[PDB]
Amino acid sequence: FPSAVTIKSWVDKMQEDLVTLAKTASGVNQLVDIYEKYQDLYTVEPNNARQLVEIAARDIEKLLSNRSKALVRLALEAEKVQAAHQWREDFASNEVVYYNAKDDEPGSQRIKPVFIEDANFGRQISYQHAAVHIPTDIYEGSTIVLNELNWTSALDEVFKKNREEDPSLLWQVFGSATGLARYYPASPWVKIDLYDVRRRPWYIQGAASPKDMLILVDVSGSVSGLTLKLIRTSVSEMLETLSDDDFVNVASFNSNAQDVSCFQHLVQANVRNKKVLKDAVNNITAKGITDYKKGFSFAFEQLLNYNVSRANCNKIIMLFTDGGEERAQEIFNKYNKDKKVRVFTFSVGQHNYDRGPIQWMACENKGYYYEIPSIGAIRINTQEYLDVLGRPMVLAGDKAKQVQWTNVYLDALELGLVITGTLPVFNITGQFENKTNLKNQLILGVMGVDVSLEDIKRLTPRFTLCPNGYYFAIDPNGYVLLHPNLQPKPIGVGIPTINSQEPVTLDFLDAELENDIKVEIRNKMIDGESGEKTFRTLVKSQDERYIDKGNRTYTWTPVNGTDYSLALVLPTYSFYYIKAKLEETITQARYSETLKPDNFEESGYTFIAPRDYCNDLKISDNNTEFLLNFNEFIDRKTPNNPSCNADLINRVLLDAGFTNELVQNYWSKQKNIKGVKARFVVTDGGITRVYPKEAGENWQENPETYEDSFYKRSLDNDNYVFTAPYFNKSGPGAYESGIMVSKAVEIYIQGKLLKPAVVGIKIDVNSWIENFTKRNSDVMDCVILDDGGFLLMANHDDYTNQIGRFFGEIDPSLMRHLVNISVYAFNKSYDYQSVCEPGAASKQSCITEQTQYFFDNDSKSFSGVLDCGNCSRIFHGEKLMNTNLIFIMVESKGTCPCDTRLLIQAEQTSDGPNPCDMVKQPRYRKGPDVCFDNNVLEDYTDCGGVSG
Ligand SMILES: *[C@@H]1O[C@H](CO)[C@@H](O[C@@H]2O[C@H](CO)[C@@H](O[C@@H]3O[C@H](CO)[C@@H](O[C@@H]4O[C@H](CO)[C@@H](O)[C@H](O)[C@H]4NC(C)=O)[C@H](O)[C@H]3NC(C)=O)[C@H](O)[C@H]2NC(C)=O)[C@H](O)[C@H]1NC(C)=O
Ligand SMILES: *[C@@H]1O[C@H](CO)[C@@H](O[C@@H]2O[C@H](CO)[C@@H](O[C@@H]3O[C@H](CO)[C@@H](O)[C@H](O)[C@H]3NC(C)=O)[C@H](O)[C@H]2NC(C)=O)[C@H](O)[C@H]1NC(C)=O
Ligand SMILES: *[C@@H]1O[C@H](CO)[C@@H](O[C@@H]2O[C@H](CO)[C@@H](O)[C@H](O)[C@H]2NC(C)=O)[C@H](O)[C@H]1NC(C)=O
Ligand SMILES: *[C@@H]1O[C@H](CO)[C@@H](O[C@@H]2O[C@H](CO)[C@@H](O)[C@H](O)[C@H]2NC(C)=O)[C@H](O)[C@H]1NC(C)=O
Ligand SMILES: *[C@@H]1O[C@H](CO)[C@@H](O[C@@H]2O[C@H](CO)[C@@H](O)[C@H](O)[C@H]2NC(C)=O)[C@H](O)[C@H]1NC(C)=O
Ligand SMILES: *[C@@H]1O[C@H](CO)[C@@H](O)[C@H](O)[C@H]1NC(C)=O
Ligand SMILES: *[C@@H]1O[C@H](CO)[C@@H](O)[C@H](O)[C@H]1NC(C)=O
Ligand SMILES: [Ca+2]
Numbered sequence: 001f002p003s004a005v006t007i008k009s010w011v012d013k014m015q016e017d018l019v020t021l022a023k024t025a026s027g028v029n030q031l032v033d034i035y036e037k038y039q040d041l042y043t044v045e046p047n048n049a050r051q052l053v054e055i056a057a058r059d060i061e062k063l064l065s066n067r068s069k070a071l072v073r074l075a076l077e078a079e080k081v082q083a084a085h086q087w088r089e090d091f092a093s094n095e096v097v098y099y100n101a102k103d104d105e106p107g108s109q110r111i112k113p114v115f116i117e118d119a120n121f122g123r124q125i126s127y128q129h130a131a132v133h134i135p136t137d138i139y140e141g142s143t144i145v146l147n148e149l150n151w152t153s154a155l156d157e158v159f160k161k162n163r164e165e166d167p168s169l170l171w172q173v174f175g176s177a178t179g180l181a182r183y184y185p186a187s188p189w190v191k192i193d194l195y196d197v198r199r200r201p202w203y204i205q206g207a208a209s210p211k212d213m214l215i216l217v218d219v220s221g222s223v224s225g226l227t228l229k230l231i232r233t234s235v236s237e238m239l240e241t242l243s244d245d246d247f248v249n250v251a252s253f254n255s256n257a258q259d260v261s262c263f264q265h266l267v268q269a270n271v272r273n274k275k276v277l278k279d280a281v282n283n284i285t286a287k288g289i290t291d292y293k294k295g296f297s298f299a300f301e302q303l304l305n306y307n308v309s310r311a312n313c314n315k316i317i318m319l320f321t322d323g324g325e326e327r328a329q330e331i332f333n334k335y336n337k338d339k340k341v342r343v344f345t346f347s348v349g350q351h352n353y354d355r356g357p358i359q360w361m362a363c364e365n366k367g368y369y370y371e372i373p374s375i376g377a378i379r380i381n382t383q384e385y386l387d388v389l390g391r392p393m394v395l396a397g398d399k400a401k402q403v404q405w406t407n408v409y410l411d412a413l414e415l416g417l418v419i420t421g422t423l424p425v426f427n428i429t430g431q432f433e434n435k436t437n438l439k440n441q442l443i444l445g446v447m448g449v450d451v452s453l454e455d456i457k458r459l460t461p462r463f464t465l466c467p468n469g470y471y472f473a474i475d476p477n478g479y480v481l482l483h484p485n486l487q488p489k490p491i492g493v494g495i496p497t498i499n500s501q502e503p504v505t506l507d508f509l510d511a512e513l514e515n516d517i518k519v520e521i522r523n524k525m526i527d528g529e530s531g532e533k534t535f536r537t538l539v540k541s542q543d544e545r546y547i548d549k550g551n552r553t554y555t556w557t558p559v560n561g562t563d564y565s566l567a568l569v570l571p572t573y574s575f576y577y578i579k580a581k582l583e584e585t586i587t588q589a590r591y592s593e594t595l596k597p598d599n600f601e602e603s604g605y606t607f608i609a610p611r612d613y614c615n616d617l618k619i620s621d622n623n624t625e626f627l628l629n630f631n632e633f634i635d636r637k638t639p640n641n642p643s644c645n646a647d648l649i650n651r652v653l654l655d656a657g658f659t660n661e662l663v664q665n666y667w668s669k670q671k672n673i674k675g676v677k678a679r680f681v682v683t684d685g686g687i688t689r690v691y692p693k694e695a696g697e698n699w700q701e702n703p704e705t706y707e708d709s710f711y712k713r714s715l716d717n718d719n720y721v722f723t724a725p726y727f728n729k730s731g732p733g734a735y736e737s738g739i740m741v742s743k744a745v746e747i748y749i750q751g752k753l754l755k756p757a758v759v760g761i762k763i764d765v766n767s768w769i770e771n772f773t774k775r776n777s778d779v780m781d782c783v784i785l786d787d788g789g790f791l792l793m794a795n796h797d798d799y800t801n802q803i804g805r806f807f808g809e810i811d812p813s814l815m816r817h818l819v820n821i822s823v824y825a826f827n828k829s830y831d832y833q834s835v836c837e838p839g840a841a842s843k844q845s846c847i848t849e850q851t852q853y854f855f856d857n858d859s860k861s862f863s864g865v866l867d868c869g870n871c872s873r874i875f876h877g878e879k880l881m882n883t884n885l886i887f888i889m890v891e892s893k894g895t896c897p898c899d900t901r902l903l904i905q906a907e908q909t910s911d912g913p914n915p916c917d918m919v920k921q922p923r924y925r926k927g928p929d930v931c932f933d934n935n936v937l938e939d940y941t942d943c944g945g946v947s948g
Contacts, residue, residue: 001780001874001891004863008878011887015880017771018741018763022720025676026759028743030666034658035747035756041587041654042580044749047465049532049555053568056471059459061561064421067449068403068561070162070172071423074155075401075447078174078425081154082444085429087147096149101131102189105141108149113186120170122414123187127163130156131186135196137376138179148178159184168455170415173448174425175203177387190413198383201243201503202406206422206446208389209932210245211314212266213238216299217281218321219252220290227349228286231320234348234372235281238318238382242269244407244477244505245927247311249302250277253295254288262916265308268925271502272915275493290321292328300335309922313931314389316342319361323353327360336365340934343367344385350374359945369944391441392935394426400932405562407479407503408453410488416452417488417504419481423447441939456482463611463648466574466684466755467706468539468550468715473559473566474525476926478507481564485511491832492845494911498838507923510832513540513547521554523924525565528558538827539716540852542709544907546788547827547854550716573715573746573753578684580650585639591657592634595687597627604663604679605696607703609652609686614644623703648686655685655757667691675771677738677764682711683757695762698737714744714758719882724790725804734803738762739792769793769800781892783807787884789815789824789853789905796892808903814875814890815903817866823877825856836909849910855884871896 023029088094091107099111113126132149134140152174159172163184173183175197189195197203215235223231235250242248247266251259261280267273299317335341343365345358350373362369368388370381393400406420425444430436460471460482473481480486483506490500508522517535524531534553541548556567582588595606608627610619617633620626639646659681667679678695682688682705690699701708714721723740725733742760746753772784776797784793789807794800799810808815818824834848862877873896877888893899 001876004861004876007876007887007889008861011878011880014772014887015883015885018880018885019720019882021675021763022741022743022761025670025673025679025761026741026743027662027666028745028759031658031662031681031757031759032745032747034661035745036749039749041582041657042578044576044752044754045579047570047575047577049553049568049570053471053555053557053566056460056568057557057559057566060456060473060564060566061559063451063455063459064403064405064559064561066166067421067451070166070169071403071421071447071449072401073162074158074172074174074449075423075425077158078152078155078444078447079428082151082425082427083429083432085147085151088150089143091146091150096146096153098132098149098153099129099186100140101133101187102193107141107146115186115188120168121185121187125185125187127160127185129186130159130182130184131189132180132182133189133195133197134180136193144178145180148176148180152176152182155182156184170418170450170452170455171411171413171448173450174445175200175448176445177443178445187413195412196379196383198386199241199379200412201409202420202422202448203446204241204386205243205245205404205406206424206448207386207443208393209313209930210311210928211242211247211316211389212303212311213242213246213248213269214266214299214302214315214317215239215248215250216257216295216317216319217250217252217260217284218254218290218295218319219284219286220254220288221286222290222351222353223322223349224286225349227322227351228284230348230372230375230378232281232284233375234346234378234382235320236278237378239269239274239277240501241383241386242274243503244268244270244479245311247309248273248277250281251295251298251302252284253291253298254286255291255294256288257291257295257298260284263919265302265305266310267915267919268309268922270505271491271493273919276915290324292324292326293331296328296331297335300331300341303341309925309927311927311931314342314933315340316344316367316385316389317365318385319343319345319358320348321346321358322349322351323347323355324357325354327357332361332365339364339366341365342388344370344388346370346372346381348372355945359943362945363943366938366940367943371944371948387442388940389933390424390443391938391940392932393424394441394443395935395937396932400424402930405451407475407477407505408481408486409503410490410500411450411452415450416454417486418450418452421447421449421451438939453482462706463651463684464577465570466577466715467708467712469568469570469574471566471568472508472511473564474508474522476526476528476563476565477505478509478522478526478923478925479505480508480511483508483511487833489833489835490845492834492847493832494847495909496836496838496844496846497841499841504833506832509923510830513538513827513829519924521556521567525556525558525567526924526926528563528565530557532556538854540829541713542707544831544850545790545852545905546709546713547852548713548716548787549854571716573755576752576754578651578654578754578756579647580654582650582654587657588639588653591653591660592631594656594660595627595631597624597631600696601693602664602668603660604667604689604691605693605699607688607690607699607701609704609706611648611686611704613648614641616644621703652685652687655683656687658757659683659687659689663689663691675764675767676761678762679759680761681757681759682708685757695737698732700731700733710740710742710760711758714742714760715755717744717884719743719884721884722786722792724786724788724792727802727805735765738764739768765803778892778894780889782887782889784885784887786886787853787855789818792885793887806903806905808905810902811893812900812903813868813893813898814866814873814888816900817864817875818877818888819853821862821864822856823862824853826851826853828852830910830912831907834907836907846909847911848907849912850907851905853905855879866890868896868898871898 096108115124181197248269345362532555875890
């Protein structure tokens with residue numbers, strides 16, 4: 001074991017060699033000088049967040065205002081047209097003409113459309129008319145459906161008017177209480193089809209107000225058998241009808257009432273809680289004697305908690321029995337004396353018990369009685385309770401017409417992530433003279449208009465700011481409407497164990513790394529108020545392997561019209577951006593004919609960022625086709641560009657010109673360098689250049705500058721950054737490309753700190769380990785790790801074979817000791833939008849736990865002794881200056897024959913966090929302030945038992 005002085009000398013020598021090699025081959029100062037000398041082809045412009053966030057908020061508000069105007073127009077026309085209807089009972093000669101979707105009966109005709117291919121949709125559409133979807137188990141050609149089709153045939157004119165007034169308009173849909181949906185533009189529908197309009201989240205949120213559902217399940221002996229599996233399926237289907245604004249709990253009684261799970265009070269009824277409740281209700285067994293009084297007392301006591309967050313709206317008890325003999329007048333009289341709580345009752349299964357008390361309990365408490373004798377009746381009967389809850393909303397009048405917006409969800413017609421604006425439609429036939437009032441207390445249906453998240457993203461440009469900043473909008477529930485980490489895939493729950501109809505609800509604290517200041521900012525945004533806050537965060541890298549600490553500023557404002565709150569995340573060194581200023585065509589050409597694909601042998605292989613410069617250029621991500629399209633467009637277009645913004649074009653041409661001088665004047669002079677296998681440069685303008693042509697196909701980086709992990713990692717740091725290659729044959733790069741090293745250039749025009757681009761090289765691994773040797777020493781091992789504990793240097797030539805691997809996966813004994821002595825800190829997180837292989841009980845959605853390691857303390861020297869039992873191994877470690885590299889030595893693994901379980905840093909599937917103790921102290925949220933219930937003029941004189 002050598003002393004500390006010699007090891008410090010070796011570390012200093014090799015770190016100076018590496019820094020000098022990188023500074024010379026990359027040419028950081030040469031590019032800095034190139035950027036510094038011109039100062040005339042461009043200018044420096046501020047990035048003042050306070051007006052940027054407000055401008056983006058105003059744009060989002062205007063978009064939502066257009067959508068709300070269209071919704072109001074559609075609702076008004078639908079009400080007016082349905083008011084003047086005749087209800088004809090025959091359709092023999094008066095045929096109904098409509099285009100039925102999902103097609104390749106007497107009473108109606110069929111339309112054959114043209115179906116031209118059109119953009120903004122991933123399918124073939126027709127603007128000539130509207131398509132109609134009728135669920136499979138609903139017969140088209142009956143009197144109800146034919147009358148509905150006839151009176152809804154008049155909505156196509158308003159669909160066309162809305163589309164003409166705003167071409168950038170997606171689906172417009174009328175969802176009927178009959179069951180059909182008429183949507184525009186007409187498209188063919190997407191095995192068997194189980195789509196039902198009345199089960200959709202937008203229809204459900206528009207059909208009533210939030211609720212406080214409580215489900216009583218009878219688990220006595222008489223429900224054993226098929227009337228128990230039907231009860232379980234019905235409870236699951238009814239839980240499927242709730243949302244994040246509704247609060248639910250499930251209780252079961254057999255001579256004694258108790259909660260079926262760990263909750264013990266109403267919960268937010270989100271994905272995790274609903275999954276827990278479904279799992280709990282799947283585990284109930286039937287035994288005992290029914291006692292309605294105890295179960296109803298439990299249910300009534302559960303709705304008077306008020307110590308927990310609730311909806312403070314519709315309070316309903318949803319009883320699931322077969323048939324009893326007790327009416328329990330005392331419990332109903334005692335608890336809801338004034339009938340402030342509704343009681344819906346369900347009789348499940350095929351049996352011969354008495355249904356009288358069930359119907360009486362439904363009728364005496366503003367409720368409704370339903371019969372579910374088979375599986376086929378489960379879906380319809382578990383969604384009809386929204387008709388009863390909608391009576392106070394229709395009786396409210398025009399005050400109960402407010403455009404609401406759903407959570408982010410995947411469109412049924414394969415359009416991506418969308419939100420839906422919603423407006424209910426009322427039945428007002430005979431309300432001109434105000435005489436019917438009998439069936440006019442139910443809604444006709446729901447208006448819907450879809451807004452894709454790409455439309456919202458188009459209103460928040462990000463190319464005028466560094467790849468680190470971004471925008472994000474937050475729901476008053478804490479979910480993110482817009483975020484870089486949000487993905488177009490359903491969020492996972494638990495672990496998929498087997499023998500996308502849910503909303504994509506991702507919380508703000510789950511999209512990025514949580515912090516004590518993140519919670520404060522999120523709470524300040526949820527209630528709604530402008531503000532700004534600068535602080536120092538620890539940020540995860542684009543690839544989930546690194547964490548680095550950097551300064552950030554969050555500037556947030558509320559959107560006026562809606563309840564979303566929009567915030568901009570902007571780091572330092574990005575308050576100023578380079579804006580190209582040039583109107584001379586000669587320099588534009590001298591820059592443009594640099595990017596010729598057949599002229600890369602001397603200019604290096606060039607990659608273009610597939611940015612949407614304008615509509616004429618269509619991205620392809622091949623970057624060979626796209627580069628040819630780009631330079632053909634540049635060489636074949638006049639600079640007028642009627643609908644093609646040149647600011648991106650100006651920036652990319654200016655950066656191409658800068659890179660041309662960087663490559664020709666400096667890189668070309670030294671064609672070959674010993675310890676270099678590739679030299680690369682990436683810029684914010686949207687290009688990268690790799691000098692070796694043979695390294696062009698080994699450049700496994702995304703062409704877009706803003707999506708490169710190493711770019712942002714180098715921006716955050718102020719020193720050279722190493723990147724460990726991926727492990728276990730993920731292609732080329734382990735031995736044939738080398739270790740990638742990057743460094744970001746800093747520019748001072750008027751003293752402002754600017755980072756327009758990054759440079760870097762790829763050290764040849766063979767020459768680098770050869771310089772390291774000056775090998776196979778069985779006495780001691782000497783390795784180099786990066787910030788993250790990934791292997792970069794080895795000594796035994798077997799570890800060298802497996803490079804770019806986590807240190808703990810091969811030598812956990814010393815990795816755990818390093819973590820213990822606080823030389824590496826680590827943080828874990830949950831990824832909910834991940835797919836994985838299932839397990840014993842294709843790939844499915846799951847929650848995966850991720851771990852990331854980073855430097856703990858600012859100290860640079862460490863030494864100590866590891867006691868692994870019956871041995872004692874001394875170890876030393878020094879962090880290389882002006883980089884993120886550490887050199888550590890210890891005795892060989894053979895000296896002490898101990899090997900504990902290996903420390904894995906990877907995508908570990910899990911199911912955390914536990915929701916039983918998560919609901920004890922829930923996150924802050926704000927609920928809607930509009931509640932419609934207990935209207936005095938409610939009829940409520942009809943249940944499901946009097947008619948049947
Ligand atoms: C909006 O509300 C209005 C009223 O507020 C509503 O208009 C009413 O529609 C019903 C149809 O459901 C009309 O009922 C008429 O009278 C009976 C009752 O259904 C029908 O005769 C048979 O009734 C049995 C039910 O026992 C039924 O099974 C059978 O199919 C019916 N027909 C037969 C046997 O041939 C009449 O056919 C029916 N229609 C007539 C007489 O033209 C009410 O008269 C309507 N009320 C008013 C004031 O117009 C309207 O439907 C609601 N909107 C929507 C979208 O439903
Ligand atoms: C529900 O279905 C009804 C029958 O299919 C539709 O009623 C028909 O509408 C036609 C045009 O809208 C009418 O044609 C003309 O109507 C005017 C109105 O006063 C009159 O000049 C004549 O009745 C007629 N003119 C002619 C034949 O030259 C039909 O008379 C009328 N009734 C029928 C066919 O029995 C409804 O329009 C439809 N509802 C909706 C909302 O579309
Ligand atoms: C919370 O709910 C409980 C019952 O669910 C309410 O009742 C009190 O609970 C606390 C707990 O020790 C004690 O004060 C008494 O046992 C209960 N009665 C009274 C009169 O306090 C309680 O009031 C609710 N609110 C709070 C803040 O606990
Ligand atoms: C992420 O960063 C570190 C990872 O170890 C942890 O933060 C530390 O939390 C303790 C708890 O009291 C504090 O005393 C330290 O000062 C924190 N370190 C800092 C702020 O650098 C933790 O795992 C994560 N930090 C969070 C969740 O705030
Ligand atoms: C939302 O509306 C409020 C008020 O309606 C806007 O508040 C403005 O605030 C600035 C400075 O704080 C004032 O100079 C304006 O006069 C206020 N507006 C009005 C109408 O008085 C707020 O800016 C709006 N939100 C956004 C994002 O613009
Ligand atoms: C629609 O919204 C945009 C902002 O996104 C606004 O400029 C425009 O005036 C609105 N109306 C129409 C008809 O485009
Ligand atoms: C990837 O998994 C292990 C991890 O080191 C590796 O040894 C193995 O060779 C790789 N899998 C295959 C099929 O080669
Ligand atoms: Ca019983």
